[PDB]
Design a protein around this ligand. Sequence first.
Ligand code: 3PE
Lengths: 80, 89
Amino acid sequence: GREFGNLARIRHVISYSLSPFEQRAFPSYFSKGIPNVLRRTRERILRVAPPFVVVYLIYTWGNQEFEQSKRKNPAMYEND
Amino acid sequence: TLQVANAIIGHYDCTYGGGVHLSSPLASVAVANKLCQSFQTFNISYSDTGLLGAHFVCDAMSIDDMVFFLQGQWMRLCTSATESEVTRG
Ligand SMILES: CCCCCCCCCCCCCCCCCC(=O)OC[C@H](COP(=O)(O)OCCN)OC(=O)CCCCCCCCCCCCCCCCC
């Protein structure tokens, strides 16, 4: 019922493609991969990173608070 | 030789009176499955180059099947050509 031939109505659209044996599999891989990755990470880093930053701060604070919770209070054994 | 190969595949359109008894297997399967409206084979030649292939006219819901059968015929001519179809071509 839902196969190729009856998916959508498309008019006046031209597509050009070439054979995979005709073109390279890695056309300028590093020289255009690096700026594209940098663009994607600079468009998403402010939405993604600060929650995990404050997870790191909460994790370190909780671990150190537990460590000083196990620490001996020097105020005890001071009266006698 | 390539022209003989085209003569094995041949041409067809919807006004042909042969019915299902056409000698071309592509034309016979097109009549049997109501796939294409027409097809033809061409060997266009230019100075040390050219285009050798097939052009077919059909509705949308048949297209892939036509391609499949057409490619099968080409591979049959690459692998399993017999003397009778060569004599006919
Ligand atoms: C006011 C924005 C100013 C931005 C200045 C930066 C320069 C902008 C112009 C140059 C372009 C730089 C690249 C742009 C990349 C995409 C755009 C972008 O980053 O937009 C800012 C982004 C979206 O802004 P918007 O959603 O409108 O802000 C609502 C804030 N709630 O908003 C953000 O990224 C802000 C995200 C802040 C998230 C704070 C979360 C704090 C709480 C975390 C709790 C986690 C759990 C804690 C523990 C719970 C249990 C104990």
